[PDB]
Amino acid sequence: TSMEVIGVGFGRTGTASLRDALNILGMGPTYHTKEILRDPARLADWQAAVGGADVDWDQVFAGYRSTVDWPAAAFWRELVERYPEAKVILTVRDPVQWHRSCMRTIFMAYRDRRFGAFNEIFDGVFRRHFGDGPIQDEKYAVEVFEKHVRDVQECVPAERLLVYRVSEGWPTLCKFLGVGVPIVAFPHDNDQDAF
């Protein structure tokens, strides 16, 4: 299928831990914003995609077998259609807790030089969900978060979708993917030192 797992949850829903877990389970290498922080030239792919280019997703994800997090979650419909055999994982969270975490981290802007273009490109990524509305407004952002959960559940067949909280750890994830439960601890990446 080329793609094993497409994570379509928003950032700050445990996506770094899910990345690590998919990697442990042999479903990786797993794309994540971390890959763009390691190689900022990858920003060009997402800048093109946000701008309406006919993206070659096999080139965007060359070298990777799964993806989680933004930016790819802002293209979730495209990717579910492009990779119909991939399993889809929607990570969820209390949406109020989610937004409060975002305001301290990835949405801080809404109140090295290799990342000069990062904020403008990711503004385009986020606004594929938020539109021109107020990202910083908790009531609005909760509505966007809840709409996305409904949209995913209405679009992806239930047998191909896992609605997942990372606090569940291995058992539900591994049952969904059809693999055994690892001995190693389930990841708990707080995803804080990038800030």
Query: Any contact of residue 166 with ligand A3P (CB under 6 A)?
Result: yes
Contact 76, 13 (CB under 8 A): no
- Residue from the set 123, 137, 143, 189 that interacts with ligand A3P by CB under 6 A: 189
Q: Which amino acid would we find at residue 193?
A: D
Interacting residues with ligand A3P between 86 and 125 (CB under 6 A) = 101
**Bridge partners of 164?**
91
Interacting span for ligand A3P (CB under 6 A) from 6-14, 42-50, 75-83, 117-125:
6-14
Burial of 160 (0-12, 13-18, 19+ CB in 10 A): middle
Interacting residues with ligand A3P between 12 and 41 (CB under 6 A) = 12-17
Distances (CA, A) of 77 to 19, 73, 174: 20, 9, 24
Query: Any contact of residue 191 with ligand A3P (CB under 6 A)?
Result: yes
Residues near ligand A3P (CB under 6 A): 11-17, 101, 166-167, 186, 188-191
